Design a protein around this ligand. Structure first.
Ligand SMILES: Cc1cc(OCc2nnc(SC3CCCC3)n2-c2cccnc2)ccc1-c1ccc(S(C)(=O)=O)cc1
Ligand SMILES: Cc1cc(OCc2nnc(SC3CCCC3)n2-c2cccnc2)ccc1-c1ccc(S(C)(=O)=O)cc1
Ligand SMILES: Nc1ncnc2c1ncn2[C@@H]1O[C@H](COP(=O)(O)OP(=O)(O)O)[C@@H](O)[C@H]1O
Ligand SMILES: Nc1ncnc2c1ncn2[C@@H]1O[C@H](COP(=O)(O)OP(=O)(O)O)[C@@H](O)[C@H]1O
Lengths: 96, 575, 576
């Protein structure tokens, strides 16, 4: 499934364009701690040979406590510059 | 030279500038015998790279006025005490060649003071410029046009009467204007036949005229790199025929678009939505009511004036993915009025940041782009953020909604902006929003019917190749209570299944030639050229109803919570 | 030249300026034999484009005083160290031509320092200007008038005694003044007969004199574009007769109004409300009580002084929504012909959310300047609702905005003219301190309109709309057992909407017939629905609804009897 969602649009963009389907650009891994979600994201990034950016929970908590969310804009701009990239938001539920 | 043809984008403010400047310039002698004050200054503002200087130069050339360009930093870079001489000499020279147009590019550098006004010499420059601008003795016909990123960046005294009394927001070009900009920027490169500039234009959302030119140049450079370099036959001047032999292919443009990085994607878009009533399959009562409320006052303003009735300028859509945003876009498209959409994330950002003055800026932008349909999508987001069952200790009032109410109360003057609100939680919406003069006309958008579902499926599958074998009416009828979002998900899943099957099949077939090289090459074409019945059956296997019947029950409750009494249904006059 | 005729708006501060300046200027020799200090400086402030410079020039011309104009940036644009020479020479030249008027346009540039006072040379300019202004040796009769957007923008020392001791807020022109401004700005364009300038004036809310001139010019340019361009017959000078043949039509003015963008719609409006007691059909006890409280102290101040009674300067309207409290306040203001200032709930909520209650001080000062005025605080309970109402915050009813309002009211009453009127739909949650003596103590209850009141409300709502005599209005009013004013307005609006839709649909179909079957002889039968009929009103009433439930009326009745005059004194008799 990860191979599909990430690799297929780039390896075969023509076939995605033929059917007029825009591939999803977001995937949310859910599961118990320590099962390899971060490793899975790294592996999927490696297979596509695309840059990998990891935003762990401490960074999000720092942005939330400091009331400085403009860093999200900077992070997204950095991810945009390093394309192809896999922007991974590890442990996104930390703020909740 | 440069003219209206060079000015691309068809953004329809060039026409306004023309109407502004012909008679003052095209017929200057007329104003000599008629007592009227022409436009002494015009403030063109918008994102950088939108061609404001190009527009001014084209107007000057097409009207014959002597164009004078006063670069912001050109004068600012000069030594203090003699830059003032440069500005004064520029105005005198422009005065000599009456009629003349004085263009001040990057005006936010000569007079950037927003009442902060740091420094000493820059205050002198701003004050002297003010004296010159207000010093126009209405003699001759010098028109001073200035360029600025935003109206509030320049000194407010420059915005006052007689200095710059009228402003035009050039704004980002739209798909139609992006296409015309591409055409103007692609006219001497001998564009290939396969490339059409239409697909690129649609995918070019977020670019400006400068961005479009840069993308075209990058595509040309990719074409030059791909070919004519392998041969490496180069001289002092490349042969014209050799260079003409190359044609910019669609692949080069696609790569350039991938390498675009548009310079202001975030900037708000003021564009006539391309959505049409065809996309929505039904809502005939809702469609007619929307047509009434919006279109009737403008199509037949005289009849509204005859009965002394002021049409409501606010409508609040409530409902469960049912197409409220699409309905608003369709209604805007029918009236051919600009559409501005304020999604929930923007409101939440204004609320978290405690910056509600952005509401004032948003309303001003909507006012400038008239006729417009200011849509506040998912307006209940702030109430949800504060709770909804218990929430905060205070009432429903919040900073952002209060500012919106203040702007609406101070609105209606413009006679063109129309506020449309969409909310999935009508119970938690602030009651003040529904008071008269606000979004009082509540419209309920129900789950799409069978016919509506068929139309939604057709709209979602219009682009995708769908085999005639797969019956769409049966699928729509089968989906008893699927929402528009659910139908879209089903169509997307079917397309995904078809794409995966096609990719896997052609990949295997390629192994088959590599493993067993056939003596004669005869491709059988695509094993799956269009979406079939089995793909749709597998996709529907995963079909799901996002909207439960309990939330539909709550919406039905609110709807009957706007109950027209139960005793007047038989009201008859005494006769 | 320019005179009182050119000065439009009839805003009634030009009269005050005249009364200020005639004797100092019109009779300068009189002050030589009488020991009195005239007005050394007058500070005209208001929104830009209101004609302050025009007013000063007109006063100078009509009084014969030598007018001198000291442009703000003209001196500011000059080189440092020699601008001071320009200011000093300007005062000396004005001194020579006594009597003279020195006008300082855009005074907020020469002396903008609000005690922040950035820079060095500008401090010199402000101090030297202060020395000159205070240096007037009371000889000659030079009067220094200055223009500024707001009083607080200029240096406070300029506002002190002897520099600028009296201020006039020209303010935005009103409908009557907007109409007069349009007349003055439309006098040489040969305005068409169809255009009346009255409808445009009413729809011109939010414009200033400059805005009105710009709108008129835009309409003229639209007329010039629509015609005389198609012919394209142009020469060095357009023929006067050819240009006169065109008449500015109502359509051109309508388009210009659509393309106006008034330069200060948000600015607060100080205007005599046009609403009259006719709009409200009843409230005779309430009407008489309001007449007493407001009108009696001014119409007969002597009798109030005789009994040594100070009339209450605060009234709090309480009642269900949509019953006409705002309209009642406007009517009472209109009867006394006093300016009306309305502070709706959104403004209070903005001040509360932004933690900026100093705006209350500014609002009260503005009300004080525009005397006689009726300062109305519409929906004053908004802050209490925002904080809760059933449980609310942990603290009491006191809040920042209400506390500032109380402080201003306590510091008020000095003016003897501002009258505070408060309207609230939730009297239970209103702060009790608001009702203490010296505050809005006179509580007035506005009940749901009666049958006669309902008839009057329906007539007022339907006065503009063409209503057929067949539709009986008394029957409709009586039929509506408990409809509020808002409910009646909604019914009338729905009936008008139904009539408009039917007329549009019918004439549209009738046009298809002409197009589908071109008739040999054109004979329009006029409008198929020329006025609102019985069927339209029946369909509209089909959707009639009672916004105000009987339970909230029960709560209001409870509070009303919660202001119960005891139960043992009703028979009080003196011993005789
Ligand atoms: C005649 C009139 C037109 C109007 O405006 C019409 C209008 N133009 N562009 C637009 S906007 C654009 C259209 C599509 C997207 C938005 N509108 C408009 C107005 C209201 C609601 N929707 C549109 C207002 C009010 C009136 C009048 C009604 C009664 C009376 S009397 C004293 O009782 O006789 C006087 C004046
Ligand atoms: C004589 C007097 C007049 C007054 O003011 C009258 C007034 N003029 N403009 C206005 S305002 C405008 C009118 C319509 C809108 C608002 N008012 C006014 C005053 C109070 C309430 N409403 C209006 C105050 C107080 C007194 C006095 C009473 C007793 C005594 S003793 C020592 O016991 O003998 C001394 C002084
Ligand atoms: N609609 C357009 N048609 C042709 N060129 C455009 C257009 N829009 C932008 N450009 C390009 O933008 C370049 C510079 O942008 P400019 O006109 O100076 O606007 P700004 O001053 O706001 O940056 C120009 O050299 C021009 O090539
Ligand atoms: N009531 C009025 N009657 C005639 N002209 C007015 C009026 N109000 C404003 N104007 C116009 O406003 C123009 C400039 O405004 P101005 O008098 O300088 O006020 P301010 O200095 O505050 O901007 C004038 O040229 C005049 O035509």
């Amino acid at each position: 499934e990860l191979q599909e969602l990430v690799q297929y649009p780039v390896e075969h963009p023509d076939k995605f364009l033929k059917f007029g389907m825009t591939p999803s650009k977001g995937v949310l891994f859910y599961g118990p701690p320590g099962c390899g979600k971060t490793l899975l994201a790294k592996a999927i990034a490696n297979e596509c040979q695309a840059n990998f950016i990891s935003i762990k929970g401490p960074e999000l908590l720092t942005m939330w406590f400091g009331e400085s969310e403009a860093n999200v804009r900077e992070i997204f701009d950095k991810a945009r510059q390093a394309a192809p990239c896999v922007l991974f938001f590890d442990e996104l539920d930390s703020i909740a | 030279e440069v003219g209206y043809d060079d000015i691309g984008g068809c953004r329809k403010q060039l026409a306004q500038i023309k109407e502004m400047v012909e008679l003052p310039l095209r017929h200057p002698a007329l104003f000599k015998a008629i007592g009227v004050k022409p436009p002494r200054g015009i403030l063109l503002y918008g994102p950088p790279g939108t061609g404001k200087t190009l527009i001014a130069r084209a107007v000057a050339n097409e009207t014959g006025a002597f164009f004078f360009l006063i670069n912001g930093p050109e004068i600012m870079s000069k030594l203090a005490g003699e830059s003032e001489s440069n500005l004064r000499k520029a105005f005198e020279e422009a005065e000599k060649n009456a009629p003349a147009i004085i263009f001040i590019d990057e005006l936010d550098a000569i007079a950037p003071k927003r009442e902060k006004t740091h420094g000493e010499v820059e205050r002198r420059i701003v004050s002297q410029l003010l004296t010159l601008m207000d010093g126009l003795k209405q003699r001759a016909h010098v028109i001073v046009m200035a360029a600025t990123n935003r109206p509030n960046s320049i000194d407010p005294a420059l915005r006052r009467f007689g200095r710059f009394d009228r402003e035009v927001d050039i704004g980002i070009p739209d798909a139609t204007g992006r296409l015309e900009i591409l055409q103007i920027h692609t006219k001497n490169m001998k564009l290939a036949d396969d490339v059409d500039l239409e697909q690129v234009a649609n995918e070019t959302h977020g670019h400006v005229g400068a961005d479009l030119a840069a993308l075209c140049s990058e595509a040309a450079l990719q074409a030059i790199r791909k070919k004519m370099d392998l041969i490496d036959l180069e001289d002092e001047t490349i042969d014209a025929e050799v260079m003409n032999s190359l044609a910019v292919t669609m692949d080069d443009f696609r790569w350039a678009l991938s390498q675009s990085n548009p310079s202001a994607l975030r900037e708000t878009v003021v564009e006539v939505p391309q959505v049409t009533w065809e996309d929505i399959g039904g809502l005939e009562d809702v469609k007619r009511e929307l047509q009434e409320l919006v279109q009737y006052p403008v199509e037949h303003p005289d009849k509204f004036l005859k009965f002394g009735m002021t049409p409501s300028k606010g409508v609040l859509f409530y409902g469960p993915g049912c197409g409220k945003t699409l309905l608003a876009k369709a209604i805007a498209n029918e009236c051919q009025a600009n559409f501005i959409s304020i999604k929930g994330p923007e409101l939440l950002t204004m609320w978290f940041g405690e910056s509600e003055a952005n509401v004032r800026e948003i309303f001003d932008k909507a006012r400038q782009a008239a006729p417009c349909v200011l849509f506040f999508d998912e307006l209940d987001s702030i109430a949800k953020a504060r709770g909804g069952n218990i929430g905060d200790g205070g009432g429903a009032a919040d900073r952002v909604i209060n500012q919106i109410l203040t702007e609406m109360d101070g609105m209606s003057t413009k006679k063109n902006v129309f506020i449309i609100g969409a909310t999935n939680r009508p119970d938690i919406i602030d009651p003040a929003i529904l008071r008269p003069g606000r979004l009082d006309q509540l419209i309920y958008i129900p789950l799409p019917d069978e016919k509506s579902r068929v139309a939604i499926l057709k709209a979602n599958l219009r682009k995708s190749p769908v085999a005639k074998d797969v019956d769409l009416e049966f699928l729509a009828k089968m989906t008893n209570g699927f929402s528009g979002a659910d139908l879209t998900e089903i169509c997307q899943r079917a397309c995904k299944l078809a794409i995966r099957e096609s990719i896997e099949s052609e990949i295997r077939r390629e192994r088959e030639r590599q493993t067993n090289p056939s003596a004669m090459e005869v491709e059988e074409d695509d094993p799956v050229p269009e979406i079939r019945r089995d793909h749709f059956e597998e996709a529907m296997r995963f079909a799901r109803r996002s909207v439960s019947d309990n939330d539909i029950r709550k919406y039905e409750m609110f709807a009957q919570t706007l109950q027209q009494s139960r005793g007047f249904g038989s009201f008859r006059f005494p006769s």
